[PDB]
Amino acid sequence: YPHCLQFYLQPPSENISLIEFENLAIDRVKLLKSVENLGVSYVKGTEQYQSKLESELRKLKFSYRENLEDEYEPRRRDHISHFILRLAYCQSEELRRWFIQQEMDLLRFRFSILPKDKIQDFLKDSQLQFEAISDEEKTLREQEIVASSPSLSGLKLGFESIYKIPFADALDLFRGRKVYLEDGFAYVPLKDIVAIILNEFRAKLSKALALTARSLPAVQSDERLQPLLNHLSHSYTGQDYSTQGNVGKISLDQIDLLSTKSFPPCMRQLHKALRENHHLRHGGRMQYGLFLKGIGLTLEQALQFWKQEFIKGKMDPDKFDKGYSYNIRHSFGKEGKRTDYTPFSCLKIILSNPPSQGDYHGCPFRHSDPELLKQKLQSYKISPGGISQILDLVKGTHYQVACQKYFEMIHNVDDCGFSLNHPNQFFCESQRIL
Amino acid sequence: QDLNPDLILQYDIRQKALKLTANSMYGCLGFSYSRFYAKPLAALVTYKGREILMHTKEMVQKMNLEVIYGDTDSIMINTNSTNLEEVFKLGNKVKSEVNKLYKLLE
Ligand code: SF4
């Protein structure tokens, strides 16, 4: 581990515990998902993006300038975590494309982190040769570089470093006659340098991921890594943390106002459907019941609420008892865990059991068409421009970010200060707004 | 139409025989039991088959349905619909799109 950035082409050969193995896998999955969501929400170059992702790195300790702390733990964490993601992600072309997008975002940000003094030794450590030119050479060949340069306006050849490269390394660059050539050597600004290195890095990663895809069947024989490595990205929440066992004071009568002021669109419309129908299908019923369990409602409050609502449902109260009260108590109590003991996370809500005719569960952004999304947004009184970028985000299949933007719009705020993954987190933050 | 039913049965038998002979084409190449045992060639064919079936899996996930079971010889697809004709035309559209994605697959 000689430098912070590193190109990942030498797999580690150390020995680590299972707990550290899972910690690295989950931490790097969280980092890449955060990179995806932040890059979707913001522009890739803004200081807000830079500082927010720096804070994400600091809370996940994945990169920093060399010191006593950096040498042992963080860069090694980066190494093994990246390779276990290689194993997780080499399954499919779609996952490979996703991983490549996020790792290019990560590597470009990290390169922007590195100060200009250390980029020379980084390229030297990169094992592929590139020679920076001297100031005298730059001054002598400035006119040639400007004359042969791309549409960059003016003669200004600023502080940006210029390197010497074999011509075969920049084929697509020079083949447009937008660079000067000297004895088979090119001279290039920093933006095109990083473009070249990222293209080469994507080529090497594509080949390596294909090779690991050829190596998956042998390495999947293990039983303690199959159920994880099948689903690091597909169906794992990034520490949603809205686990059962929370506390709070909720008044049963206030449920309507709390639904219209603090519920994510899916749960809001589910509660309205319950109020207007006094009956739900299995999926929506279980979803809303365990959500109400999560928000802090106690067992007696939940039972009384559901019984009262089925009073308007017109079935026998003893039938209610025998049929459902067992199910609600089981959800609040004993095992059957991870399906009835837990509050549903957003990634689960979107990927599991899409609603059908007569169903109202499921995230509406992913499970209903844009015209009905627009109708619902009009019914919820959001500005037409806000609805416009909501639909733009829906076209970009970033449903969680769309829900985020809906949250700031309904709360009349700018940034929620997080990235939502759990409806109970949505509700907790809305209560934090008071 | 307007053909002798016996000849129709003969045509059906010939078509089914062609189907099974095709299906066994890969059989004759990958087995230590065979004359032409080609470990690398068989591995490449199986890798491509797994890749294409799995790609079909995620993309049919994209087209807003759900898959529940498939191993290189059948794909189980849930519909979330109760109209048989709608389900059939959904199958037809996914068949057509997968046929234009991969030319010779039937
Ligand atoms: S993003 Fe999650 S919380 Fe928001 S509406 Fe969709 S499923 Fe509900």
Q: What is the 3 state secondary structure string of chain A? A: CCCCCCCCCCCCCCCCCHHHHHHHHHHHHHHHHHHHHHHHHCCCCCHHHHHHHHHHHHHHCCCCCCCHHHHHHHHHHHHHHHHHHHHHHCCCHHHHHHHHHHHHHHHHHHHHHCCHHHHHHHHHHCCCCCEECCHHHHHHHHHHHHHHCCCCCCCCCCCCCCEEEEHHHHHHHHCCCCCCEECCEEEECHHHHHHHHHHHHHHHHHHHHHHHHHHHHHHCCCCCCHHHHCCCCCCCCCCCCCCCCCCCCCCCCCHHHHHHHHCCHHHHHHHHHHHHHCCCCHHHHHHHHHHHHHCCCCHHHHHHHHHHHHHCCCCCHHHHHHHHHHHHHHHHCCCCCCCCCCCCCHHHHHHCCCCCCCCCCCCHHHHCCHHHHHHHHHHCCCCHHHHHHHHHHHHCCCHHHHHHHHHHHHCCCCCCCCCCCCHHHHHHHHHHHC
- Cβ contacts of residue A365 below 8 Å, gap of 6+? A265, A373, A394, A399, A402, A403
B44-54: b (≥16 Cβ within 10 Å) or e: eeeeeebeeee
Q: For the purposes of burial, counting CB atoms within 10 Å of the CB of A109, is it exposed (0-12), middle (13-18) or buried (19 or more)? A: buried
Task: Find out whether the beta carbon of A349 lies less than 6 Å from any atom of ligand 1.
Answer: yes
* CB-based contact A38:A419 (threshold 8 Å): yes
Q: Which residue of A has its CA nearest to B58?
A: A94
- Tell the residue number behind the tokens 């597909």, with chain if given: A234
CB contact under 8 Å between A94 and B58, yes or no, is yes
Contact with chain A for residue B2, Cβ under 8 A? no
Any chain A CB within 8 A of the CB of B39? no
Contact in structure between A345 and A425 (CB atoms under 8 Å): no
- Non-local (6+) Cβ contacts of A411 within 8 A are A430, A433
Determine the Cα–Cα distance for residues B31 and A65; give it in Å rounded to an integer.
55
**Cα angle for residues A103, B65, B94 (degrees, 5° grid):** 95
Q: Which pairs from A287-291 meet CB under 8 Å and 24+ separation?
A: A287/A344, A287/A349, A287/A361, A288/A361, A289/A328, A289/A331, A290/A331, A290/A340, A290/A342, A290/A343, A290/A344, A291/A267, A291/A343, A291/A344, A291/A423, A291/A424
Q: What whole-number distance in Å separates Cα of residue B72 and Cα of residue A417?
A: 46
**Buried-exposed string A179-193: b where 16+ CB fall within 10 A, e elsewhere:** bbeeeeebbbbeebb
Looking at chain A, how many residues does it have? 434
Give the C-alpha separation, A300 to A93, whole Å. Answer: 50
Answer yes or no: are the C-beta atoms of A258 and A234 closer than 8 Å. Answer: no
Subunit contact B54:A91, Cβ cutoff 8 A: yes
**Is A242 in contact with A424 (CB distance < 8 Å)?**
yes
Q: Is A428 annotated as a binding residue?
A: no
Specify the residue for token string 């995806």: A36
CA A414 – CA A139 distance, rounded (Å): 48
Which residues of chain A have a Cβ shorter than 8 Å from any chain B Cβ? 91-94, 213-214, 354-357
- For residue B77, the surrounding DSSP H or E stretch is strand B75-78
Tokens at A18, concatenated: 């299972």
Report which protein residue has its CA nearest ligand 1's atom 1: A400
Closest alpha carbon within chain B to A353: B66
Greatest Cα-to-Cα distance within chain B, rounded to the nearest angstrom? 50
Task: Decide: residue A396, CB within 10 A, 0-12 exposed, 13-18 middle, 19+ buried.
Answer: exposed
CATH of residue A169 = 1.20.930.80
A214:B47 CB<8 A: yes
Q: Residue B41 belongs to what H/E stretch?
A: helix B39-62
Q: What's the CA dihedral at B76, B77, B81, B82 to 10 degrees?
A: -20
Which H or E element spans position B68?
A: strand B66-70
Give the domain extent around A42. Answer: 7-230
Torsion on CA atoms A417, A420, A426, A430, rounded to nearest 10: 10
The answer to whether A357 and B82 have CB atoms below 8 angstroms apart is yes
Indicate the angle between helix axes A93-113 and B39-62, nearest 10 degrees: 80
Instruction: Report the candidate in A417, A363, A427 with the shortest Cα–Cα distance to residue A390.
Output: A363
Residues of B in contact with A282 (CB under 8 A): none
Helix (H) or strand (E) segment spanning residue B70: strand B66-70
Report residue A367 as tokens.
Answer: 């499970």
A166 neighbors A145 (Cβ within 8 angstroms) = no
- Residue in the structure block whose two tokens are 């890798």: B47
Q: Do residues A376 and A363 make contact, with C-beta atoms less than 8 angstroms apart?
A: no
Euclidean distance between CA atoms A203 and A197, whole angstroms: 10
Name the nearest CA neighbour of A82 among A191, A6, A185, A158. Answer: A6
CA distance A227 to A225: 6
Tokens (6 digits) for A214: 């050829």
Question: Which residue of chain A comes nearest to B61, CA vs CA?
Answer: A351
Contact A92 B66 (CB under 8 A): no
B23: closest CA of chain A, how far (Å)? 24
Inter-chain CB proximity A354 and B64 less than 8 Å: yes
Question: How far is Cα A198 from Cα A201, in angstroms, rounded to an integer?
Answer: 5
Please work out, in degrees rounded to the nearest 5, the angle formed at the alpha carbon of residue A129 by the alpha carbons of A128 and A134.
Answer: 150
Please indicate the experimental technique that yielded this structure: cryo-EM
What token pair was written down for B61?
Answer: 């996930």
- For residues A107 and A201, the answer to whether their CB atoms sit within 8 Å is yes
Resolution (A): 4.1
Residues of chain A with Cβ-Cβ distance to B66 below 8 Å are 354
Sign of the CA dihedral with B94 first, then B99, B105, and B106 last: positive
Q: What is the dihedral of CA A384, A388, A389, A390, to 10 degrees?
A: 90
The closest-lying atom of ligand 1 relative to the alpha carbon of residue A406 is 4
Instruction: Classify A251 in phi/psi space as left (phi over 0), alpha (psi -120 to 50) or beta.
Output: beta
For residue A127, give both structure tokens.
């094992």
Let me know: does A368 contact A291? Beta carbons within 8 Å: no
CB B54 within 8 Å of CB A91? yes
Residues on chain A touching B58 (C-beta within 8 angstroms): 92, 94
- Region of A239 (left: φ > 0; alpha: ψ -120 to 50; beta: rest) is left
Inform me whether the C-beta atom of residue B80 falls under 8 Å from chain A C-beta atoms.
yes
Q: Using DSSP bridges, classify how beta strands B66-70 and B75-78 pair: parallel, antiparallel or unpaired.
A: antiparallel
The annotation status of A4 as a binding-site residue, yes or no, is: no
